[PDB]
Enzyme design. Structure first.
Site, mmCIF file in Angstrom:
data_model
loop_
_atom_site.group_PDB
_atom_site.id
_atom_site.type_symbol
_atom_site.label_atom_id
_atom_site.label_comp_id
_atom_site.label_asym_id
_atom_site.label_seq_id
_atom_site.Cartn_x
_atom_site.Cartn_y
_atom_site.Cartn_z
ATOM 1 N N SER A 197 0.882 -1.089 -0.123
ATOM 2 C CA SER A 197 -0.017 0.013 0.199
ATOM 3 C C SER A 197 0.840 1.435 -0.112
ATOM 4 C CB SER A 197 -0.972 -0.018 1.062
ATOM 5 O OG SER A 197 -1.917 1.040 1.201
ATOM 6 N N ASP B 15 -8.755 -4.025 -5.855
ATOM 7 C CA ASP B 15 -8.646 -3.111 -4.629
ATOM 8 C C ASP B 15 -8.925 -1.878 -5.336
ATOM 9 O OD1 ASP B 15 -7.027 -1.287 -3.058
ATOM 10 O OD2 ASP B 15 -5.639 -2.832 -2.806
ATOM 11 N N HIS C 190 -7.815 -4.509 -1.252
ATOM 12 C CA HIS C 190 -6.923 -4.133 -0.338
ATOM 13 C C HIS C 190 -6.701 -4.826 0.990
ATOM 14 C CE1 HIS C 190 -3.796 -1.102 -0.007
ATOM 15 N NE2 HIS C 190 -4.221 -0.790 1.356
#
Ligand SMILES: [Cl-]
Ligand SMILES: [Cl-]
Ligand SMILES: [Cl-]
Ligand SMILES: [Cl-]
Lengths: 574, 577
Positions: B441, B520, B552
């Protein structure tokens, strides 16, 4: 939940298992065997349940020895990964001691034979392809060859070989050991596949035609070609479609290994000898008994005695894994137009019946699923998948008519063939759920299947695939010619049979496995495909790998290319 | 010389599979509500008397905060294959495994929520807004629209309190009413609120994090007045925490607070410190008269413990071999380009010499921290023979508001220097023989930021679920994430552009491994495809792995393996080079 470390462990063992090829008989009466593992290769003498290693560092191959010679010529790459080879002599009584043959400059060694007195080989350089003879008085160039060429046999002064000298066909050639020169015997409408010189100084050769293979005699004194007649008619009654290998044994009998329908048979002077089901290599006479190599979809390459089929040398697998890879069989699947599609099936010992089944589609398309060892199919069986391997139209091994039916019809009949095989697996009771998996043209088929036949497969794996014929055509000389041929020169076929134009129809999860930097199957079209899939909310997985080698040798290659496919499919098994 | 692939898979498999637990509350007849990663997925459990009962069927993402004793649990489950469009599912605690979908709530991104037993109160984001909602007998009602990401902290009677990221990366306190709705926002000129709970006196007690210190304040919701809260024991104040993880009033009226400094936390009841296992603690609840919390550490996967004994009620196990691959952990203070000291956790592999292969593992968020807490990534690296260096770059939590807010308007700026200083430190301290970077991320963003702006620092990079292009990402994101991007970039399109790694691909000189879940919605895929086109166009080598039906928030065994294994393989291959 998916047992990932089990799959990697099994894939590891299937990649590592030693694989053997029979090369000949030396040192009086010892087998010369080359053993291969993780892409690493060595030479061995075998006699009576034991081996001795002849080389030191890994080699590439060895030259064909004459029965009984007291030495072996190793061929070894001079850099690591480079086409340039060097030759190394080893005396069979002093294994592990190598004498480099300095008279031969590095070059691409294509083949060779060692009579014991002279080493005869073909090689390619910047300048040329040539036939060479190396004897005690140095190196001589016997002839320049108008193309890639391979020595088959030497008897006395006569040298015979096979040459790719043009017109899409393999031609026969001869030369002389003392005087050199070249004579080429054109194969007419077929191709020569193997050759050996008779005691009568005739060249016996295997001639493969549009339909059935022919054993012929070629008199090198006048180029006359006659069908050869053998004392036993087993061979003729077998009606082979191809001839893998032939050679005269020391006692003068002719050994031939021929095949049809993906399996081979062994013959001595025309009489058939019992052999393990699968495919066989060269046959040698050893202490009065016959010995060959054997492989099958369930058996890594190994050395067997005939007719018992008892292994002399075979690589080791654990009891666990051997039981996962059950027998192979051929079945004739009936396709949409009634034509029968020869399809090899490999049963998993780790899957019930009915059970998960993968339709594993071969590349090419001018290629064949035969009953021979395949790391991919074996890995699937190990992971708990039955494997179905259909020789769709376009395949080799079943005559020119079957091969040429694909021309002008990619993603047409041959898809029906693949689809019929899948259908067959469900309705025969083998398959509880169906998957498709393929590389290169096989990956194209995968995409072709998921677009044109949604709801047939539960998931698909497409490796090194092509996505758009029209884009590919404008981006590609050789491959442009091929694409033109395959599509019958029709831009309408290029467009309609390109999977990227039908993404909309995909209803199943797709796994793309692709090389990052290969101009043959470029990546750009695959990114476009991925953008399209994403835009339309399709499920897909992608693994994009740099510097993949076009063959599974090592554990590294397997991890890059094969592992993600097996993982993906095991997760789709939910 | 050759990479031992089967050993890595085995170790990675076990470290992912180990059960992990989180404490959510108390329900039904004095039963612990626990969320566990167990049997390969995220599930909800009742614990009572040495047994668990599974409440859900298919894996879930999380559950709403129950009020003590309620007879039901609200599951939050993604109904969009990773894209984080969530739906709510009710389960009666007496009929575990039977789910009733709450059809009045259309799918959206569920940010938080509380279940009083009568009304379900939650915050959610759609394309067009972030809102506070109440679901009761009168259907679904929108109590208020929120000017940013917001989270419900507590409900007592009609009063609702929460924390909102309503600009400048500051966290404000808000309140609303259950019956009438509306929104009142309370700002601090001193800092950010980190947690909140409503007292029996209907005051909001909140943790206020200031420049370099935290403390506890009382906020009267009727007039916005803020007073330092006075506790009957001085242990808490003597601890001098720098951050407040969580606080809440227990049924018997005592105030539970979990506060931290230097990446370890402590538990306090009415100011009095309670003995707890070294590491980090989550929420505290009262259960059968005893105090119960979650515990984790760099060596201890998330588990549920009783206090003060620290005896585990639920935990997973690791084999001794894995336990030994983590030789030791320590905190070090790395000096960055501007003299700021960067608190950096180091995990030394038992399977690597010194100096040896070292990965700089960059955390996500960015409002998050590398602490003495379990990290699957880090443990996997130690297992594979890599030392792991984990720097709390500026933007991190756990070290005061000033450190956290330095990132605002300066992504791929100072915080990169911090990450770069940590790497430098590992080489020159003798720990590292070669350096790699790896992150997920915001951590993947940093990986790309590093390989573009600091080529030649790292030998190879792994970027997972990364940010690539702030502009394109802005266009693709929902209300909440669009607001957050605005905040981090200081509302500057020039920052969005110049700090997007896709605009600097030309500078990359090292092998890059990209790993991304396909669906995501925090870090979308589309910009990554373009990156791959850019890498290809510019003649860079890279590898990429795109995982299907995952976004995610990776909640299964299979997704985790597919996201983590390729990273470790790649790095092990870069090592044999
Ligand atoms: Cl067999
Ligand atoms: Cl399996
Ligand atoms: Cl409800
Ligand atoms: Cl600091």
């Amino acid at each position: 939940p998916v047992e990932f470390s089990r799959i990697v462990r099994d894939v590891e063992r299937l990649i590592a298992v030693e694989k053997y090829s029979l090369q000949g008989v030396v040192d009086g009466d010892k087998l010369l065997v080359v053993g291969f593992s993780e892409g690493s290769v060595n030479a061995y003498l075998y006699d009576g349940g034991e081996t001795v290693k002849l080389n030191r560092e890994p080699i590439n191959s060895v030259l064909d020895p004459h029965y009984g010679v007291g030495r072996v010529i190793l061929v070894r790459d001079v850099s690591k990964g480079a086409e340039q080879h060097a030759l190394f002599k080893v005396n069979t009584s002093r294994p592990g001691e190598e004498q480099r043959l300095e008279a031969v400059k590095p070059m691409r060694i294509l083949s060779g034979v060692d009579t014991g007195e002279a080493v005869v080989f073909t090689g390619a350089t910047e300048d040329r392809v040539a036939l060479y003879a190396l004897d005690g008085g140095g190196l001589r160039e016997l002839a320049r060859l108008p193309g890639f060429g391979f020595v088959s046999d030497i008897r006395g002064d006569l040298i015979a070989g096979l040459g790719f000298f043009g017109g899409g066909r393999v031609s026969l050639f001869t030369s002389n050991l003392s005087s050199g020169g070249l004579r080429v015997f054109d194969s007419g409408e077929g191709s020569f596949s193997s050759a050996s010189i008779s005691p009568g100084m005739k060249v016996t050769a295997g001639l493969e035609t549009a339909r059935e293979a022919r054993l012929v005699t070629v008199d090198p004194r006048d180029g006359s070609v006659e069908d050869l007649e053998l004392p036993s008619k087993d061979f003729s009654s077998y009606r082979p479609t191809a001839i893998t290998w032939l050679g005269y044994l020391p006692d003068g009998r002719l050994a031939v290994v021929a095949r049809r329908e993906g399996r081979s048979a062994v013959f001595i002077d025309g009489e058939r000898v019992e052999a393990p089901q699968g495919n066989h290599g060269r046959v040698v006479l050893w202490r009065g008994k016959l010995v060959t190599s054997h492989t099958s979809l369930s058996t890594p390459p190994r050395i067997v005695s005939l007719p018992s089929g008892e292994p002399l040398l075979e690589g080791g697998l654990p009891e666990d894994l051997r039981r996962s890879i059950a027998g192979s069989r051929l079945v004739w699947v009936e396709s949409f137009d009634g034509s029968r599609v020869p399809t090899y099936v490999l049963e998993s010992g780790r899957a019930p019946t009915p059970g998960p089944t993968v339709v594993l589609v071969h590349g090419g398309p001018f290629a064949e699923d035969s009953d021979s060892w395949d790391t991919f199919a074996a890995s699937l069986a190990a992971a708990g998948f039955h494997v179905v391997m259909p020789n769709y139209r376009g395949s080799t091994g079943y005559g020119e008519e079957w091969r040429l039916k694909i021309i002008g019809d990619p993603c047409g009949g041959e898809l029906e063939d693949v689809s019929a095989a899948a259908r067959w697996a469900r309705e025969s009771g083998l398959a509880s759920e169906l998957y498709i998996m393929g590389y290169s043209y096989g990956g194209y088929m995968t995409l072709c299947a998921l677009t044109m036949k949604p709801g047939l497969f539960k998931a698909g794996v497409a490796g090194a695939s092509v996505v758009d014929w029209e884009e590919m055509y404008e981006l590609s000389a050789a491959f442009r010619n091929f694409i033109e041929q395959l599509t019958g020169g029709s831009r309408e076929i290029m467009r309609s049979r390109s999977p990227i134009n039908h993404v909309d129809r995909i209803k199943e999860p797709l796994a793309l496995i692709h090389p990052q930097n290969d101009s043959r199957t470029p990546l750009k079209p695959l990114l476009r495909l991925m953008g399209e899939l994403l835009a339309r909310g399709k499920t897909f997985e992608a693994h994009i790998i740099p510097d993949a080698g076009h063959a599974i040798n090592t554990m590294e290659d397997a991890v890059k290319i094969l592992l993600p496919a097996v993982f993906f499919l095991a997760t789709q098994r939910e």
